[PDB]
Amino acid sequence: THKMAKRRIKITGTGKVMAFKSGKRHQNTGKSGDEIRGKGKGFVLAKAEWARMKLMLPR
Amino acid sequence: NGRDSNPKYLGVKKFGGEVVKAGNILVRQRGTKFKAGQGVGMGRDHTLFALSDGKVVFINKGKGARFISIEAAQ
Amino acid sequence: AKDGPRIIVKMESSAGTGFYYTTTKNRRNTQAKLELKKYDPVAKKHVVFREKK
Amino acid sequence: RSRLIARLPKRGFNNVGTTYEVVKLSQLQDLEDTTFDRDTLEAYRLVRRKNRPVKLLASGEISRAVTVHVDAASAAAIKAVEAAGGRVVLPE
RNA sequence: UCAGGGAACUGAAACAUCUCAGUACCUGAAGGAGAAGAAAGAGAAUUCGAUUCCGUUAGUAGCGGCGAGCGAACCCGGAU
RNA sequence: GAAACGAUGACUGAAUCCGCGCGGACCACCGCGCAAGGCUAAAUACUCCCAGUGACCGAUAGCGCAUAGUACCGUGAGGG
RNA sequence: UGUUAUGGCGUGCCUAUUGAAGCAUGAGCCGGCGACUUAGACCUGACGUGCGAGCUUAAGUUGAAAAACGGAGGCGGAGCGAAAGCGAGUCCGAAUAGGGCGGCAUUAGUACGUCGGGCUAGACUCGAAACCAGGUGAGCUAAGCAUGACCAGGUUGAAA
RNA sequence: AACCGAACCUGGAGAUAGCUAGUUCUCCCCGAAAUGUAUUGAGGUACAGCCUCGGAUGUUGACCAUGUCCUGUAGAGCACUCACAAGGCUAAACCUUAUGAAACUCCGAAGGGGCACGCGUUUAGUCCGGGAGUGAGGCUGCGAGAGCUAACUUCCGUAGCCGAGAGGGAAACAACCCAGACCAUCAGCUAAGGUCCCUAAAUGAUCGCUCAGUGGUUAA
RNA sequence: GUAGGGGAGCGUUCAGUCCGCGGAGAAGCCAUACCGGAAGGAGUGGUGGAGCCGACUGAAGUGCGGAUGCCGGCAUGAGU
RNA sequence: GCGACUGUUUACCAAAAUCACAGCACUCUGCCAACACGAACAGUGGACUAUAGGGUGUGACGCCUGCCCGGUGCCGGAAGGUCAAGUGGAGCGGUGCAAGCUGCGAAAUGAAGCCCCGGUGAACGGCUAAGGUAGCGAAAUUCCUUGUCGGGUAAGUUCCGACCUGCACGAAAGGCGUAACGAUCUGGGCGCUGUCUCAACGAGGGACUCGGUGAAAUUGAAUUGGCUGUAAAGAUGCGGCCUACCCGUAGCAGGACGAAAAGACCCCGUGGAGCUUUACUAUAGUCUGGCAUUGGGAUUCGGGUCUUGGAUUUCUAACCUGAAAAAUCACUUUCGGGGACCGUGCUUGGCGGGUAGUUUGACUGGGGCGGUCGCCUCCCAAAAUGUAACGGAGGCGCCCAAAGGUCACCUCAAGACGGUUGGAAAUCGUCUGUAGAGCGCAAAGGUAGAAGGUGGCUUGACUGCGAGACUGACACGUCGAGCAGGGAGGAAACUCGGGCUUAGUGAACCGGUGGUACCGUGUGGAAGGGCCAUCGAUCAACGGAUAAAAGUUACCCCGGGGAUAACAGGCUGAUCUCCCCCGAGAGUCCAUAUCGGCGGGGAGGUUUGGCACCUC
RNA sequence: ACCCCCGUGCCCAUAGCACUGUGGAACCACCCCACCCCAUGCCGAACUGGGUCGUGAAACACAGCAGCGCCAAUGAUACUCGGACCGCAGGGUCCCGGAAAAGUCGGUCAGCGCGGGGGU
Ligand SMILES: CC(=O)C(=O)N[C@@H]1/C=C(C)/C=C/[C@@H](O)C/C=C(C)/C=C/[C@@H](O)C[C@H]2OC(=O)[C@]1(C)C(=O)[C@@H]2C
Ligand SMILES: [K+]
Ligand SMILES: [K+]
Ligand SMILES: [K+]
Ligand SMILES: [Mg+2]
Ligand SMILES: [Mg+2]
Ligand SMILES: [Mg+2]
Ligand SMILES: [Mg+2]
Ligand SMILES: [Mg+2]
Ligand SMILES: [Mg+2]
Ligand SMILES: [Mg+2]
Ligand SMILES: [Mg+2]
Ligand SMILES: [Mg+2]
Ligand SMILES: [Mg+2]
Ligand SMILES: [Mg+2]
Ligand SMILES: [Mg+2]
Ligand SMILES: [Mg+2]
Ligand SMILES: [Mg+2]
Ligand SMILES: [Mg+2]
Ligand SMILES: [Mg+2]
Ligand SMILES: [Mg+2]
Ligand SMILES: [Mg+2]
Ligand SMILES: [Mg+2]
Ligand SMILES: [Mg+2]
Ligand SMILES: [Mg+2]
Ligand SMILES: [Mg+2]
Ligand SMILES: [Mg+2]
Ligand SMILES: [Mg+2]
Ligand SMILES: [Mg+2]
Ligand SMILES: [Mg+2]
Ligand code: NA
Numbered sequence A: 001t002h003k004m005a006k007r008r009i010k011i012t013g014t015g016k017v018m019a020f021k022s023g024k025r026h027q028n029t030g031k032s033g034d035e036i037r038g039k040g041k042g043f044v045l046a047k048a049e050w051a052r053m054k055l056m057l058p059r
Numbered sequence B: 001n002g003r004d005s006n007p008k009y010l011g012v013k014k015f016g017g018e019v020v021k022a023g024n025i026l027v028r029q030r031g032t033k034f035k036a037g038q039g040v041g042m043g044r045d046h047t048l049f050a051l052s053d054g055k056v057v058f059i060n061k062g063k064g065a066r067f068i069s070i071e072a073a074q
Numbered sequence C: 001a002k003d004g005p006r007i008i009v010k011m012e013s014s015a016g017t018g019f020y021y022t023t024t025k026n027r028r029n030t031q032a033k034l035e036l037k038k039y040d041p042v043a044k045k046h047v048v049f050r051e052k053k
Numbered sequence D: 001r002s003r004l005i006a007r008l009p010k011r012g013f014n015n016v017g018t019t020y021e022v023v024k025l026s027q028l029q030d031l032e033d034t035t036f037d038r039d040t041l042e043a044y045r046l047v048r049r050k051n052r053p054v055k056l057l058a059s060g061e062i063s064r065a066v067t068v069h070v071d072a073a074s075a076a077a078i079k080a081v082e083a084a085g086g087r088v089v090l091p092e
Numbered sequence E: 001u002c003a004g005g006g007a008a009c010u011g012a013a014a015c016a017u018c019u020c021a022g023u024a025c026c027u028g029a030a031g032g033a034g035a036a037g038a039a040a041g042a043g044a045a046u047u048c049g050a051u052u053c054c055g056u057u058a059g060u061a062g063c064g065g066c067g068a069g070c071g072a073a074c075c076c077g078g079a080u
Numbered sequence F: 001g002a003a004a005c006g007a008u009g010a011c012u013g014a015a016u017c018c019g020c021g022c023g024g025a026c027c028a029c030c031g032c033g034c035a036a037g038g039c040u041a042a043a044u045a046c047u048c049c050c051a052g053u054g055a056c057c058g059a060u061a062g063c064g065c066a067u068a069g070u071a072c073c074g075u076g077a078g079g080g
Numbered sequence G: 001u002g003u004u005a006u007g008g009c010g011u012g013c014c015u016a017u018u019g020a021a022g023c024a025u026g027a028g029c030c031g032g033c034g035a036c037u038u039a040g041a042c043c044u045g046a047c048g049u050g051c052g053a054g055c056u057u058a059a060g061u062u063g064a065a066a067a068a069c070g071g072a073g074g075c076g077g078a079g080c081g082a083a084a085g086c087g088a089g090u091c092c093g094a095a096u097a098g099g100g101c102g103g104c105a106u107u108a109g110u111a112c113g114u115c116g117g118g119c120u121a122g123a124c125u126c127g128a129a130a131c132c133a134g135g136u137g138a139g140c141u142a143a144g145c146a147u148g149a150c151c152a153g154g155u156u157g158a159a160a
Numbered sequence H: 001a002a003c004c005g006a007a008c009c010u011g012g013a014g015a016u017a018g019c020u021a022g023u024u025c026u027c028c029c030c031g032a033a034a035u036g037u038a039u040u041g042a043g044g045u046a047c048a049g050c051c052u053c054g055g056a057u058g059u060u061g062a063c064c065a066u067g068u069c070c071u072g073u074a075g076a077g078c079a080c081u082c083a084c085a086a087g088g089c090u091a092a093a094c095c096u097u098a099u100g101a102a103a104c105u106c107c108g109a110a111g112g113g114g115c116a117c118g119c120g121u122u123u124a125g126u127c128c129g130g131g132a133g134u135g136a137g138g139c140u141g142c143g144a145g146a147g148c149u150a151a152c153u154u155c156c157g158u159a160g161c162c163g164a165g166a167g168g169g170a171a172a173c174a175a176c177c178c179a180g181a182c183c184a185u186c187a188g189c190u191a192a193g194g195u196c197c198c199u200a201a202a203u204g205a206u207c208g209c210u211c212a213g214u215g216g217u218u219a220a
Numbered sequence I: 001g002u003a004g005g006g007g008a009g010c011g012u013u014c015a016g017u018c019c020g021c022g023g024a025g026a027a028g029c030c031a032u033a034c035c036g037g038a039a040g041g042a043g044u045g046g047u048g049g050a051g052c053c054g055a056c057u058g059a060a061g062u063g064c065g066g067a068u069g070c071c072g073g074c075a076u077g078a079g080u
Numbered sequence J: 001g002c003g004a005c006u007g008u009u010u011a012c013c014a015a016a017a018u019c020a021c022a023g024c025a026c027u028c029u030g031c032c033a034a035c036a037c038g039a040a041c042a043g044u045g046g047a048c049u050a051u052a053g054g055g056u057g058u059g060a061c062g063c064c065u066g067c068c069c070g071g072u073g074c075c076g077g078a079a080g081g082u083c084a085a086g087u088g089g090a091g092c093g094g095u096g097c098a099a100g101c102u103g104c105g106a107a108a109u110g111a112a113g114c115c116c117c118g119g120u121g122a123a124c125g126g127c128u129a130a131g132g133u134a135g136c137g138a139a140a141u142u143c144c145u146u147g148u149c150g151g152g153u154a155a156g157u158u159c160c161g162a163c164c165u166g167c168a169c170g171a172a173a174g175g176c177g178u179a180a181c182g183a184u185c186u187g188g189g190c191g192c193u194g195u196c197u198c199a200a201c202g203a204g205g206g207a208c209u210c211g212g213u214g215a216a217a218u219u220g221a222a223u224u225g226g227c228u229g230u231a232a233a234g235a236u237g238c239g240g241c242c243u244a245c246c247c248g249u250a251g252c253a254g255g256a257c258g259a260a261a262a263g264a265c266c267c268c269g270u271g272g273a274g275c276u277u278u279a280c281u282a283u284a285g286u287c288u289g290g291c292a293u294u295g296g297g298a299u300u301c302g303g304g305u306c307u308u309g310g311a312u313u314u315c316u317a318a319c320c321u322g323a324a325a326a327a328u329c330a331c332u333u334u335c336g337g338g339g340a341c342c343g344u345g346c347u348u349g350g351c352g353g354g355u356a357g358u359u360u361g362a363c364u365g366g367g368g369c370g371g372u373c374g375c376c377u378c379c380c381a382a383a384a385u386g387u388a389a390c391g392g393a394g395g396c397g398c399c400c401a402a403a404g405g406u407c408a409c410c411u412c413a414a415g416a417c418g419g420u421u422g423g424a425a426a427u428c429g430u431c432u433g434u435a436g437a438g439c440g441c442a443a444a445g446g447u448a449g450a451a452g453g454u455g456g457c458u459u460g461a462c463u464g465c466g467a468g469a470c471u472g473a474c475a476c477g478u479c480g481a482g483c484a485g486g487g488a489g490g491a492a493a494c495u496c497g498g499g500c501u502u503a504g505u506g507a508a509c510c511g512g513u514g515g516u517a518c519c520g521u522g523u524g525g526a527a528g529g530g531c532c533a534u535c536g537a538u539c540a541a542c543g544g545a546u547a548a549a550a551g552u553u554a555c556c557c558c559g560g561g562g563a564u565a566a567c568a569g570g571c572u573g574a575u576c577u578c579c580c581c582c583g584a585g586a587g588u589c590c591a592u593a594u595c596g597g598c599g600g601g602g603a604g605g606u607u608u609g610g611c612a613c614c615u616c
Numbered sequence K: 001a002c003c004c005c006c007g008u009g010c011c012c013a014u015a016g017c018a019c020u021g022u023g024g025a026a027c028c029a030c031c032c033c034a035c036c037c038c039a040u041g042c043c044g045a046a047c048u049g050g051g052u053c054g055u056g057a058a059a060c061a062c063a064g065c066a067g068c069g070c071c072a073a074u075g076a077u078a079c080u081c082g083g084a085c086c087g088c089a090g091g092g093u094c095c096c097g098g099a100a101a102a103g104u105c106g107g108u109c110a111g112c113g114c115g116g117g118g119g120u
């Protein structure tokens, strides 16, 4: 899907998922301190395969 | 009633003799069972942790007050 | 985190010049009017900071 | 779309403006007797792309005096060519 | 081949959009082919310069209960 | 959707030379082009028919048929 | 070798299952027919091969008892970020904490062929109640309309 | 127009089918699983565990010993909570005596687990990458709940075995006991179990028991 | 040792190439006590009356016990 | 008993109590009628017209037909409240030197409806808007029930007549009664009868035999015994034992869980179809406003500077329709009437199961009903962690400007003794007191050097980050030293990035607000888009499907399942049945001639069940 | 070197409570005053500022005392790792190791440091 090219799986030099954090951003929040300020990166070594098979070609 | 339940966890994570690192979590608990010794800090949830490198050390003074220290190698 | 007419509310944060939110759970239960404080926004800091919407 | 695919907090914004051609500095320096880069003879220097402009980036280091006529160039590139001899020409 | 009219199963691990698909079917008209065609264009170079087909662009831009999934054009080569 | 433009049913209804349309609401600038008339080889598609060819079958294959839309079935379309 | 007498031993096959000789499923027999393929310069991997920091062409043209020409284009080559952009560095950031990338003591690819597998098509084969379009049917049957035909004989005995 | 809670024929159409069945030649090697989590998920799928193949790493694997640390089950105990027997005292508390506890703990094993190392024997693990199957097991011993301390019962933990496991034994009889099939052989020794006869093997030896056919279906 | 993964090969048709066989006679069928670790192959005989083995390589419309499979032929229920 | 009757209907298992029926009632319809067929203001059917036609209900006849309209439906009234397009245009915003060229967008006004008032019940419907008038009544309504009594019979659960406690009788979904009617239903009686105790004889066509002709279902292979046990728990192929020469014919149907139909019950499948409604959604249809076809003459009301509009009224060349002469029309004409309406086209809103496309969860010792899904605390949990049940208990979906940060200071529950509105506790005082209290809520752990209680000062309930670890398949979640820009409390070391911790919450998509300026398709802006923050979530089927949704099927279909129920068998033996032990006591005296309080120990596999073992 | 006191640790009940005795100006405490710095939501009780006498009573220190607490064997037993069995069952046994609790004997009301002060 084209909603994948704009999904947090960028084709990095190596070939893994360039994730982020889905804890809480837009709604349902207001507690904790810097829980929302967790707008960093994320990575996984068990789904890189069944995710890159949809965006690999159009890197 | 059958309804209701909870996975829970807790326990000990770094046992005595082990070589910790700056940030390793030592023991998880609810209250203050294991008090922060020398070389060992304490989180909101009484979760013990290590400040630097070293070795895990248990100390018991007849129950009641538990202590965990870290003896550096070097 | 329900949201109805019930007492207490989620509050926006303003500032003297500063344009920053703190997000705080207040309550109209007791003293409910002086929602002013001091939260330095990215800036020089020390800015008069009232969450009072 | 119910397995990780969806549920990822990403909106971003697609633009895709201008992608410049990475011309490594060792390609000019090191080997070669200076064939004069210009904008036509350089095609034989293994930088055939077309449709896009040209960019000059410093990576190889061997001081040498060579003239460079690329479309655009970096801060460190220009301060590495004229530092050993040459002149980085940019379009008016 | 063009034109008029115009489904559903199916998919969406259900189903009202969308897909299927403007497909099947129906009807009208013509030929050894039609359609299309001589710019109130394409497009960004103050450029190419009828139309159609092939390759490429490219599965890109974009579209989509932003889901399934659908999906150009210009530049250029070539038939003519 | 910020949604242009083309098209169309129903209501309205401009100019034309210091003119008109367009260039993804809009405006200025800039740039391209000038409708409301028509016709027009070739490249393209398909194939009843013909020739040739085959790492195509050799008849429980191959078209359905080594001839037959015949025997046979149904009121019929049709099946075969 | 063929056949037999006798002793010992010995719970059809397949499927589906925790478990089959199953008193579970399938099968009269035999011959024949019959089930993991094909396509997309698709994606990915193993192997092999010809180039090698380069690697090939598609359409097509001219020739075909044979093949070359054709470099529009694609993959190598620099990454990082939402993007501008910057660049061996960039994004968060008001400069130092980290993530991603080079440099790591060190690692090049691409084209084609075969093959594993994925994607998209009916995708191992056979099979349902159903939905939709077009068309054929009232010579069976349920009715209407028009026009013809048929109901031995006997009994009871209304109005007027 | 012989079978209508929506006719027939043709076409879309080889509709879909988490369904059922079937799925064809050969040997060699390894070798599963029916668990966790998620699911309009429960007889289906994703991921993980578990399998195989290649490369790299190349002993970090395994068992065991030693040392160290941690966890409150069995048991027990009455010191907290609840319950509870007799008596004294003057209902409660207190005292003497005596108790019971998954949700009591003054105490507290075996065992287990993590880590370090190897004093020792063996052998594998991990990482990357291609392809999988399996996500409906059953019983027995032991430790629990549920059930009438019933069920070839259900639901968990754990060991073995069945599952994909032939052979011998238990009359027959996956699950039990003993044992893991490379093949060939008119060879030998053994295990579990037996050695009168029908099947191979001492109608064996010594000292007792039961007059019963107990063995060869149970209790107050 | 099942699902499964891996390895080495047999057989069939078509094709290129090579050595050939065939009227004193191929393929096919039929009998068999030989050979190879399996898939299989060979010798001889009988039948038959025109074409077809082996080796290497390539390409699939490639290997049957089953699907209440399909087609054809022939049985049992019975001389009922 | 029912239905009045004649009649009629499920071709092919229901001819009946169904339907129809004359009769009655409500209600619509002014005639291009209402209504209906239809792509079509065509055409036709109603139909060549108000005791005529359509629809509905009841279903001859006789006596009759109550109470309640809250709601729903409908009719009528209708001040007001709300409501679409449109009319109208202030304000706001963008671009340009400007003229100007363009987005967003009101107050008011604006149709049918809805809300609101009343009425209508042979309207749905009830017997909170009121509650059973007549009649009937255990009647086809009957549960407990075979009710009670009476009649018939030697004996009656049904039948008839009454009573009454009418589980749920009831006056047009009509109540009650009724002559006649009936291949209808029920009971009794007479007659007769091989219907029966009970079979017998006789016959005729077939079975039997011979000659001729010659099938079908089925079929893994067969050399195919009985008893017991075992095996998936129903044995001819297993074991043991017993019996049993080989091979037919005529016959009986116990077995081969016999043959036919992949089960029509049941469950499953995010299978199908038909049918319902106040499930969702749309549409035929229909009502309505505006705008065309669509004009003329006046009055009032609006206003600007000749008119532009709304309404009322009236006339007529459009249009519609009728008659006469050449029935359908085209034609010209006398005219007749309606006539700016209607019709029709576009558009707006409402109504809408007539029609259409679909949804309607799962777990579950079958399913349904009930109950229950997330998170938190103990127990189960078998001394790491983890570990299930429809196992045993109890909570949460918040709260707090302070219960926060920090800085200082205080120490509890309870008992005893003595004291005043007390007289139990409590207020006060003094001792004892490892705290047997407290910590906002559930529970555990933990706390006396406090995470118990107070006071001063403050807004660290900060921002930019985070080595390294715990935990999960993933996604999430959890702890955290240190560093930086700035602050808070204390003299200070130092601590603080919410509250003793563990629940007080939820992905993505979409959108709102502030901020900042990255993009912005010729350029420069702008719309918009991104980013930072943050808001909207009983999405509680709480890893969540759609922006948007309920039932029925005995008229049912299909794909499956002994993977899942009801029959049976099997396992078990709560229950059921029986036996046995002890013995108080009854039995005049006396435990045991008989009987056996309380309570115990077994057997059987005939009850109701459990489980779901082989057969769907 | 002897001893004592004071302050502060390790140790954190085998070093604790109770009872009793000893200590008087080196040390400690009470005590005295306290309008102000400071402070008890009331009290200078406790904090606190300035300091004689008196006393050691209380507190504290030390010593005896161990009635009570605490600590706690040996032996045996419960249970269990391993192996091997029995009953229809609830259960239970043998072999080999490890090994409680409680109770009893008994044990002890500490010991070990640093600094400062005053005495012989
Ligand atoms: C009550 C019951 O007891 C009952 O409803 N029993 C079921 C059989 C029925 C209803 C049969 C009805 C007859 O109209 C046809 C008879 C049938 C089809 C008999 C089928 C039989 O051979 C198999 C089973 O069928 C069942 O499903 C059934 C569960 C059953 O007990 C049978 C053993
Ligand atoms: K031969
Ligand atoms: K005969
Ligand atoms: K049975
Ligand atoms: Mg999902
Ligand atoms: Mg076609
Ligand atoms: Mg066998
Ligand atoms: Mg059989
Ligand atoms: Mg069978
Ligand atoms: Mg079956
Ligand atoms: Mg007559
Ligand atoms: Mg018919
Ligand atoms: Mg099919
Ligand atoms: Mg093998
Ligand atoms: Mg399972
Ligand atoms: Mg299990
Ligand atoms: Mg299996
Ligand atoms: Mg006969
Ligand atoms: Mg009588
Ligand atoms: Mg009749
Ligand atoms: Mg006779
Ligand atoms: Mg037998
Ligand atoms: Mg018979
Ligand atoms: Mg079935
Ligand atoms: Mg079925
Ligand atoms: Mg445990
Ligand atoms: Mg979505
Ligand atoms: Mg029917
Ligand atoms: Mg089964
Ligand atoms: Mg049963
Ligand atoms: Na045609």
Ligand code: NA
Pocket (backbone or CB within 6 Å): H012
């Ligand atoms: Na189709």
Ligand code: NA
Pocket (backbone or CB within 6 Å): none
């Ligand atoms: Na006879």
Ligand code: NA
Pocket (backbone or CB within 6 Å): none
């Ligand atoms: Na419907």
